[PDB]
Scaffold this active site. Structure first.
Site, PDB file in Angstrom:
ATOM      1  N   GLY C  12       0.741  -1.250   0.000  1.00  0.00           N
ATOM      2  CA  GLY C  12       0.000   0.000   0.000  1.00  0.00           C
ATOM      3  C   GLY C  12       0.773   1.303   0.000  1.00  0.00           C
ATOM      4  O   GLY C  12       0.192   2.363   0.244  1.00  0.00           O
ATOM      5  N   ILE C  91      -4.146  -1.523   2.517  1.00  0.00           N
ATOM      6  CA  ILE C  91      -4.760  -1.710   1.218  1.00  0.00           C
ATOM      7  C   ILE C  91      -6.261  -1.610   1.395  1.00  0.00           C
ATOM      8  O   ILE C  91      -6.818  -2.175   2.336  1.00  0.00           O
ATOM      9  CB  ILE C  91      -4.458  -3.121   0.684  1.00  0.00           C
ATOM     10  CG1 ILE C  91      -2.996  -3.240   0.253  1.00  0.00           C
ATOM     11  CG2 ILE C  91      -5.370  -3.467  -0.486  1.00  0.00           C
ATOM     12  CD1 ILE C  91      -2.627  -4.680  -0.109  1.00  0.00           C
ATOM     13  N   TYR C 155     -18.944   6.822   3.919  1.00  0.00           N
ATOM     14  CA  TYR C 155     -18.047   5.682   4.066  1.00  0.00           C
ATOM     15  C   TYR C 155     -18.738   4.390   3.645  1.00  0.00           C
ATOM     16  O   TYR C 155     -18.137   3.510   3.030  1.00  0.00           O
ATOM     17  CB  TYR C 155     -17.517   5.590   5.494  1.00  0.00           C
ATOM     18  CG  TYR C 155     -16.188   4.884   5.587  1.00  0.00           C
ATOM     19  CD1 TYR C 155     -15.053   5.397   4.957  1.00  0.00           C
ATOM     20  CD2 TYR C 155     -16.061   3.712   6.316  1.00  0.00           C
ATOM     21  CE1 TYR C 155     -13.831   4.737   5.042  1.00  0.00           C
ATOM     22  CE2 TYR C 155     -14.868   3.062   6.420  1.00  0.00           C
ATOM     23  CZ  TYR C 155     -13.749   3.574   5.785  1.00  0.00           C
ATOM     24  OH  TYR C 155     -12.557   2.914   5.901  1.00  0.00           O
ATOM     25  N   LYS C 162     -14.582  -2.753   6.530  1.00  0.00           N
ATOM     26  CA  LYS C 162     -13.655  -2.554   7.644  1.00  0.00           C
ATOM     27  C   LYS C 162     -14.143  -3.299   8.894  1.00  0.00           C
ATOM     28  O   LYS C 162     -13.339  -3.713   9.732  1.00  0.00           O
ATOM     29  CB  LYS C 162     -13.493  -1.070   7.961  1.00  0.00           C
ATOM     30  CG  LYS C 162     -12.745  -0.286   6.890  1.00  0.00           C
ATOM     31  CD  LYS C 162     -11.270  -0.749   6.781  1.00  0.00           C
ATOM     32  CE  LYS C 162     -10.464   0.223   5.940  1.00  0.00           C
ATOM     33  NZ  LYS C 162      -9.092  -0.289   5.642  1.00  0.00           N
ATOM     34  N   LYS C 192      -4.715  13.183   4.873  1.00  0.00           N
ATOM     35  CA  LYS C 192      -4.788  13.546   3.461  1.00  0.00           C
ATOM     36  C   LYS C 192      -3.867  12.691   2.575  1.00  0.00           C
ATOM     37  O   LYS C 192      -2.823  13.154   2.124  1.00  0.00           O
ATOM     38  CB  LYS C 192      -4.450  15.043   3.312  1.00  0.00           C
ATOM     39  CG  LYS C 192      -4.504  15.583   1.899  1.00  0.00           C
ATOM     40  CD  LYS C 192      -5.858  15.359   1.262  1.00  0.00           C
ATOM     41  CE  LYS C 192      -5.915  16.011  -0.115  1.00  0.00           C
ATOM     42  NZ  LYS C 192      -7.207  15.735  -0.807  1.00  0.00           N
TER      43      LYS C 192
HETATM   44  N1  LIG Z   1      -6.081   7.773   4.707  1.00  0.00           N
HETATM   45  C1  LIG Z   1      -6.873   7.656   5.824  1.00  0.00           C
HETATM   46  O1  LIG Z   1      -7.350   8.657   6.344  1.00  0.00           O
HETATM   47  C2  LIG Z   1      -7.173   6.334   6.479  1.00  0.00           C
HETATM   48  C3  LIG Z   1      -7.759   6.501   7.697  1.00  0.00           C
HETATM   49  C4  LIG Z   1      -8.075   5.394   8.386  1.00  0.00           C
HETATM   50  C5  LIG Z   1      -7.824   4.173   7.885  1.00  0.00           C
HETATM   51  N2  LIG Z   1      -7.266   4.019   6.678  1.00  0.00           N
HETATM   52  C6  LIG Z   1      -6.751   3.042   5.745  1.00  0.00           C
HETATM   53  O2  LIG Z   1      -5.267   3.020   5.592  1.00  0.00           O
HETATM   54  C7  LIG Z   1      -4.985   2.132   4.558  1.00  0.00           C
HETATM   55  C8  LIG Z   1      -4.098   2.801   3.617  1.00  0.00           C
HETATM   56  O3  LIG Z   1      -4.668   3.775   2.825  1.00  0.00           O
HETATM   57  P1  LIG Z   1      -3.972   5.226   2.649  1.00  0.00           P
HETATM   58  O4  LIG Z   1      -4.745   6.239   3.475  1.00  0.00           O
HETATM   59  O5  LIG Z   1      -2.517   5.204   3.095  1.00  0.00           O
HETATM   60  O6  LIG Z   1      -4.152   5.628   1.164  1.00  0.00           O
HETATM   61  P2  LIG Z   1      -3.151   5.151   0.005  1.00  0.00           P
HETATM   62  O7  LIG Z   1      -3.813   5.489  -1.322  1.00  0.00           O
HETATM   63  O8  LIG Z   1      -1.827   5.915   0.159  1.00  0.00           O
HETATM   64  O9  LIG Z   1      -2.903   3.613   0.112  1.00  0.00           O
HETATM   65  C9  LIG Z   1      -3.819   2.718  -0.369  1.00  0.00           C
HETATM   66  C10 LIG Z   1      -3.297   1.551  -0.978  1.00  0.00           C
HETATM   67  O10 LIG Z   1      -4.355   0.619  -1.427  1.00  0.00           O
HETATM   68  C11 LIG Z   1      -3.699  -0.125  -2.410  1.00  0.00           C
HETATM   69  N3  LIG Z   1      -4.545  -1.033  -3.193  1.00  0.00           N
HETATM   70  C12 LIG Z   1      -5.757  -0.777  -3.714  1.00  0.00           C
HETATM   71  N4  LIG Z   1      -6.184  -1.873  -4.383  1.00  0.00           N
HETATM   72  C13 LIG Z   1      -5.231  -2.839  -4.292  1.00  0.00           C
HETATM   73  C14 LIG Z   1      -5.091  -4.161  -4.759  1.00  0.00           C
HETATM   74  N5  LIG Z   1      -6.150  -4.754  -5.551  1.00  0.00           N
HETATM   75  N6  LIG Z   1      -3.978  -4.875  -4.482  1.00  0.00           N
HETATM   76  C15 LIG Z   1      -3.014  -4.320  -3.753  1.00  0.00           C
HETATM   77  N7  LIG Z   1      -3.106  -3.058  -3.287  1.00  0.00           N
HETATM   78  C16 LIG Z   1      -4.189  -2.300  -3.535  1.00  0.00           C
HETATM   79  C17 LIG Z   1      -3.072   0.957  -3.225  1.00  0.00           C
HETATM   80  O11 LIG Z   1      -2.086   0.484  -4.038  1.00  0.00           O
HETATM   81  C18 LIG Z   1      -2.546   1.894  -2.207  1.00  0.00           C
HETATM   82  O12 LIG Z   1      -1.193   1.705  -2.009  1.00  0.00           O
HETATM   83  C19 LIG Z   1      -6.294   1.793   3.890  1.00  0.00           C
HETATM   84  O13 LIG Z   1      -6.629   0.526   4.296  1.00  0.00           O
HETATM   85  C20 LIG Z   1      -7.270   2.796   4.373  1.00  0.00           C
HETATM   86  O14 LIG Z   1      -8.502   2.248   4.348  1.00  0.00           O
HETATM   87  C21 LIG Z   1      -6.904   5.097   5.938  1.00  0.00           C
HETATM   88  C1  LIG Z   2     -12.502   8.909   5.943  1.00  0.00           C
HETATM   89  C2  LIG Z   2     -11.088   8.495   6.200  1.00  0.00           C
HETATM   90  C3  LIG Z   2     -10.533   7.469   5.272  1.00  0.00           C
HETATM   91  C4  LIG Z   2     -10.755   6.117   5.503  1.00  0.00           C
HETATM   92  C5  LIG Z   2     -10.244   5.173   4.622  1.00  0.00           C
HETATM   93  O1  LIG Z   2     -10.451   3.827   4.831  1.00  0.00           O
HETATM   94  C6  LIG Z   2      -9.522   5.575   3.507  1.00  0.00           C
HETATM   95  O2  LIG Z   2      -9.014   4.599   2.679  1.00  0.00           O
HETATM   96  C7  LIG Z   2      -9.721   4.342   1.525  1.00  0.00           C
HETATM   97  C8  LIG Z   2     -10.960   4.915   1.266  1.00  0.00           C
HETATM   98  C9  LIG Z   2     -11.621   4.606   0.082  1.00  0.00           C
HETATM   99  C10 LIG Z   2     -11.048   3.734  -0.844  1.00  0.00           C
HETATM  100  N1  LIG Z   2     -11.721   3.413  -2.069  1.00  0.00           N
HETATM  101  O3  LIG Z   2     -12.921   3.582  -2.173  1.00  0.00           O
HETATM  102  O4  LIG Z   2     -11.104   2.964  -3.023  1.00  0.00           O
HETATM  103  C11 LIG Z   2      -9.816   3.163  -0.576  1.00  0.00           C
HETATM  104  C12 LIG Z   2      -9.157   3.462   0.606  1.00  0.00           C
HETATM  105 CL1  LIG Z   2      -7.613   2.743   0.924  1.00  0.00          CL
HETATM  106  C13 LIG Z   2      -9.296   6.928   3.277  1.00  0.00           C
HETATM  107  C14 LIG Z   2      -9.807   7.876   4.159  1.00  0.00           C
HETATM  108  F1  LIG Z   2      -9.612   9.177   3.950  1.00  0.00           F
END
Ligand SMILES: NC(=O)c1ccc[n+]([C@@H]2O[C@H](COP(=O)([O-])OP(=O)(O)OC[C@H]3O[C@@H](n4cnc5c(N)ncnc54)[C@H](O)[C@@H]3O)[C@@H](O)[C@H]2O)c1
Ligand SMILES: CCc1cc(O)c(Oc2ccc([N+](=O)[O-])cc2Cl)cc1F
Ligand SMILES: NC(=O)c1ccc[n+]([C@@H]2O[C@H](COP(=O)([O-])OP(=O)(O)OC[C@H]3O[C@@H](n4cnc5c(N)ncnc54)[C@H](O)[C@@H]3O)[C@@H](O)[C@H]2O)c1
Ligand SMILES: NC(=O)c1ccc[n+]([C@@H]2O[C@H](COP(=O)([O-])OP(=O)(O)OC[C@H]3O[C@@H](n4cnc5c(N)ncnc54)[C@H](O)[C@@H]3O)[C@@H](O)[C@H]2O)c1
Ligand SMILES: NC(=O)c1ccc[n+]([C@@H]2O[C@H](COP(=O)([O-])OP(=O)(O)OC[C@H]3O[C@@H](n4cnc5c(N)ncnc54)[C@H](O)[C@@H]3O)[C@@H](O)[C@H]2O)c1
Ligand SMILES: CCc1cc(O)c(Oc2ccc([N+](=O)[O-])cc2Cl)cc1F
Ligand SMILES: CCc1cc(O)c(Oc2ccc([N+](=O)[O-])cc2Cl)cc1F
Ligand SMILES: CCc1cc(O)c(Oc2ccc([N+](=O)[O-])cc2Cl)cc1F
Lengths: 257, 257, 257, 257
Positions: C12, C91, C155, C162, C192
């Site tokens: 990821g 991911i 969401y 999740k 972000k």
């Molecule tokens: N960004 C947030 O605010 C946030 C908050 C809470 C929880 N989470 C979670 O953190 C995790 C990471 O997301 P992020 O915020 O760093 O955004 P990100 O876009 O930087 O990372 C997301 C990753 O999902 C991967 N991905 C999507 N489909 C895939 C597949 N078929 N095979 C392999 N990889 C795949 C992408 O390559 C990417 O690297 C996620 O699980 C997201 O749900 C994120």
């Molecule tokens: C609301 C905070 C938040 C939660 C998350 O789980 C997050 O990550 C994703 C959200 C949506 C997708 N998608 O639809 O492809 C994928 C991911 Cl990895 C990002 C966030 F900003």
């Protein structure tokens, strides 16, 4: 009704907007016979009026700060009723300081002690004093609030006390359950009761749950009352140690965004 | 280490098996300077020994039952330390009756009061007395147990008190968080400490989590200590109002079946 | 550092704002050797750059939609590493429709299937494929969000996924724990990242937690990263089946009122 | 009764021990008119018998694996009923492998997909297909189990699916709540239904909750049925997004020690 023949003692009926009022109405509607407690001789006549409203002349003094009144309450009730099937604990108090503004500013050993004494201890205390006359299918019910689970502005020391109260529900359920007695709480949403005048910015909480709850509406004492009647009844025979939210689903969302 | 230069006050170090001992060792290992409290002059020398063990000559009396000792604790500490970065609250007590056998049998107004006074009130009380000298990145940590969340045999009134304690974590986090201060608890699994001699059938709980926890092993004060050091450190900068289980995952299963 | 000699595979890492980036930095800082996955040949060079950033030339393709790539991932890794000590699952994916507007409008069997396949199934799938080469003290970590616990606007189907993911943490912990392997999640606050561009009104959530969280500030990938490094390390030896909030304490309040 | 005039569709009535059977009886007893679904023509006659038992000739095929049957279900119902006031979702399935022995051994992409498709997706799928004919005070109810919240032996992939199901309750409550529709689950304790023959060591769970639940007894379909009738009724007008335990209080204890 589904409480036909059940005999139920209700605390905390202070006005016609009290949660206990709504519970009383639903219980009477479903066939229960009711009895009531009050605090201070100054209030005896008001509660007798309220009690008359529900076909009852059974009212007894009970300040839960006083062990002697707790024991005398059930001795007196026992002269009228052989058994008790339901107990409604709808009682709470903290010094105004302990529920205003910043949590620490209102924190003192005495404020803490009083809040927990009245708002938490009193529930298992009444259960213990009632125990000898409890029927085997009796049901004990207390009222809590979401501030027990999550920090809510101003709720402060009441939140700690309600947390202890919900825990008491679980331990009481284990203690009394072998006998067959059930113990539960309703975590009610905000309702404009006399007690709510205590909480600063009650209005803001009210607006906020109306706008953010899944049902997009505040709960009523009628709704909390019907839920209570259910828990007090044999309909809820399989339910104990439960904290049931009756708050339009507000606890289950993150609102305001 | 990751606590380099952090100054941390620890309560509740009674023996080399105390949870506070394990936390102290991990904190010292990671670079913290430590200070300690004790209860009763009879114990001053033992704690001075323990403190020497961790390179400290800073030990102060504090019976949390006494407001005067709480204030004098931070006045004294303040003569040695300009700022406080960490506080470990590892203190609990209930009368033996209130944690033996049936929940109601051990329930009295006084037993309730004492348990909540010592085991819950004392945490936000110390936080309030410490506040003026807390650094903006300070971290407050208390110890809880699963009995706060679910009824556990014998735990009884301590369960109510720990429920109030975990709530206090949330309200303290809101009160102190604007300043930047964090407040958390570790819900530790059973560990053979002096306090554990209090709990009847501690042995049975111990065997049971060894056999049912996901890790199939009991936790150690080393494990709880390392978790504590993490929470007390800037590594845990994004973590507040959290109750972290350090119990081999036992809380997350239904075991014994 | 406290991850000295640990070998950790991270999924990821899409950009320098990815949560996985922050975790990678903290892990490398604490002494880990890292490897990375990527999706699609179009992205191989970007991830190789990122990997170089952390002293690594170990990058492997893995689309978690494809069983063959999952197995080939660990076969390839195994040519370089005898054992795996850490796995970071960072991911997630749902079709844009399934996370926009009303929950039901975006609900289709296929949208549901894809969201759960990628966002939940993939975690225990990687764990299973990794198992043969997992060291006995290995630690598996996934990323979740508060939408799993409470309904958050937009969401939607990701919240269901999740929820299944956090449950998978618990069942994986039991399955892998006898061996000594730990499994945990961090429920991170909003950050972000590229993924956040998906969520409509991410900005509003962001403002809202800044204004309502106990710490009155949003979390950073540095904070989530340090928490992750802790969980991946022997410091967290007593912690498994845990969902740790790293969200400035936001989960623990009712905000906006 | 308190469901006078309510029209309620029940899925999952497979035998006279089915949870849906108990709910059906309580609903009919309280005045509801009922309709039923079944899976496969081989079973049409059995369900017609069951339906006759409750004064109903309204039975319709619905395999929730098939979109076409879901839409045709409500088209057919709509020829008889102008409005729908209640929906009981009492449906679940996972391949035997996915609920036997070790969680990972039974884990495959397809087993995962099927379990979540049938046991979780199907609930909001039926809600969406029913929506146009839902009365404004309608109530949707699904059945869950404690394995959603905590790891239980053998439950495995069903635990993940039930976790997604409980989340769906929350998101459905928000989606349908503006209209006034409520959505809830009952987390029922173990009951010797046909489905229970699936779960290895169901007997051990049964004995264990009898011995450890606060009520020291297992729940009955009569108890789960009465709870369901309550939630489906206007008595529960203030209750939505709730997962109500009807399990003799077992969820609230740590048993076996
Ligand atoms: N960004 C947030 O605010 C946030 C908050 C809470 C929880 N989470 C979670 O953190 C995790 C990471 O997301 P992020 O915020 O760093 O955004 P990100 O876009 O930087 O990372 C997301 C990753 O999902 C991967 N991905 C999507 N489909 C895939 C597949 N078929 N095979 C392999 N990889 C795949 C992408 O390559 C990417 O690297 C996620 O699980 C997201 O749900 C994120
Ligand atoms: C609301 C905070 C938040 C939660 C998350 O789980 C997050 O990550 C994703 C959200 C949506 C997708 N998608 O639809 O492809 C994928 C991911 Cl990895 C990002 C966030 F900003
Ligand atoms: N009103 C709400 O919004 C709300 C919401 C959630 C939970 N709860 C709770 O519901 C319960 C009932 O409060 P309410 O809202 O109906 O307000 P209320 O003012 O109508 O009732 C409160 C009762 O507390 C009683 N009381 C206070 N001190 C007492 C003592 N020493 N001995 C005996 N009785 C004493 C009062 O007599 C009064 O009847 C409380 O426990 C409250 O915490 C209330
Ligand atoms: N030992 C366990 O298994 C365990 C498990 C989970 C949670 N917790 C908790 O961990 C904390 C530490 O206990 P422990 O297990 O290390 O046992 P311990 O006996 O080693 O420590 C307990 C401390 O409580 C202190 N204390 C009691 N009354 C006091 C007072 N009036 N003023 C100041 N201090 C007082 C004692 O001095 C002692 O140092 C407690 O809060 C306990 O509830 C303990
Ligand atoms: N029996 C228990 O102990 C128990 C305990 C807690 C929760 N729950 C749940 O209660 C619900 C009812 O199960 P039960 O215990 O009454 O057993 P049951 O066998 O009597 O009912 C299960 C129903 O699932 C239905 N079903 C399976 N696949 C279907 C499909 N593709 N389309 C439509 N229907 C399908 C069956 O027809 C059957 O009627 C389930 O969701 C179960 O998970 C059950
Ligand atoms: C915020 C919603 C809410 C929650 C409550 O527990 C509540 O009840 C009380 C609040 C404060 C006191 N007191 O300080 O004396 C007493 C009671 Cl009984 C009222 C509410 F309006
Ligand atoms: C059952 C695990 C467990 C939990 C604890 O809270 C614990 O700590 C105490 C228990 C009882 C008392 N007391 O009554 O004085 C004091 C303390 Cl500090 C010890 C434990 F062994
Ligand atoms: C352990 C208690 C318990 C929980 C349940 O959810 C339950 O229902 C099912 C279990 C397994 C399947 N299946 O694999 O096809 C289907 C259902 Cl409907 C039965 C139970 F006995």
């Amino acid at each position: 009704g589904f409480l036909d023949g059940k005999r139920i003692l209700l605390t905390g009926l202070l006005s016609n907007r009290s949660i206990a009022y709504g519970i009383a109405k639903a219980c009477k509607r479903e066939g229960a016979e009711l009895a009531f407690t009050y605090v201070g001789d100054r209030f005896k006549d008001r509660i007798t009026e309220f009690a008359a409203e529900f076909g009852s002349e059974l009212v007894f003094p009970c300040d839960v700060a006083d062990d002697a009144q707790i024991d005398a309450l059930f001795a007196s009730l026992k002269t009228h009723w052989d058994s008790l099937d339901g107990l409604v604990h709808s009682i709470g108090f903290a010094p105004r300081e302990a529920i205003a503004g910043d949590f620490l500013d209102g924190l003192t050993r005495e404020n803490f002690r009083i809040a927990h004494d009245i708002s938490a201890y009193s529930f298992p205390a009444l259960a213990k004093a009632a125990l000898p006359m409890l029927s085997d299918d009796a049901s004990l019910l207390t009222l809590s609030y979401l501030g027990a689970e999550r920090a809510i502005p101003n709720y402060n020391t009441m939140g700690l006390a309600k947390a202890a109260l919900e825990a008491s529900v679980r331990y009481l359920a284990v203690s009394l359950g072998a006998k067959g007695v059930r113990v539960n709480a309703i975590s009610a949403g905000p309702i404009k009761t006399l007690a709510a005048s205590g909480i600063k910015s009650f209005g803001k909480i009210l607006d906020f749950v109306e706008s953010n709850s899944p049902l997009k509406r505040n709960v009523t004492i009628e709704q909390v009352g019907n839920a209570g009647a259910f828990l007090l009844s044999d309909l809820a025979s399989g339910v104990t140690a439960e904290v049931m939210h009756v708050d339009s689903g507000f606890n289950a969302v993150v609102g305001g965004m």
